[PDB]
């Protein structure tokens, strides 16, 4: 539902890279280049962002 704070395998901190990732895909970057501009070089830390579905933005549509 929300980006995890740590990669499950390494332990590297990922939870602070979701808004910057959307910002790079916003302009023209490919997913392969945006992930390199952030410093994710092991394929266990790239799976974290490449395969994340953000469900928290759809539970904010229901009035509290």
């Amino acid at each position: 539902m929300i980006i995890p704070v740590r990669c499950f395998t390494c332990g590297k901190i990922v939870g602070n890279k979701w808004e910057a990732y959307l910002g790079l895909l916003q302009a023209e970057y490919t997913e392969g280049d945006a992930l390199d501009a952030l410093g994710l070089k092991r394929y266990c830390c790239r799976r974290m962002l490449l395969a994340h579905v953000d469900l928290i933005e759809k539970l904010l549509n229901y009035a509290p």
Binding site: P4, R6, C7, F8, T9, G11
Partner: peptide, 10 residues
């Protein structure tokens, strides 16, 4: 299965 991955939300 990895125990210290279960501790990170797995």
């Amino acid at each position: 299965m990895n125990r210290s991955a279960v501790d990170r939300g797995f």
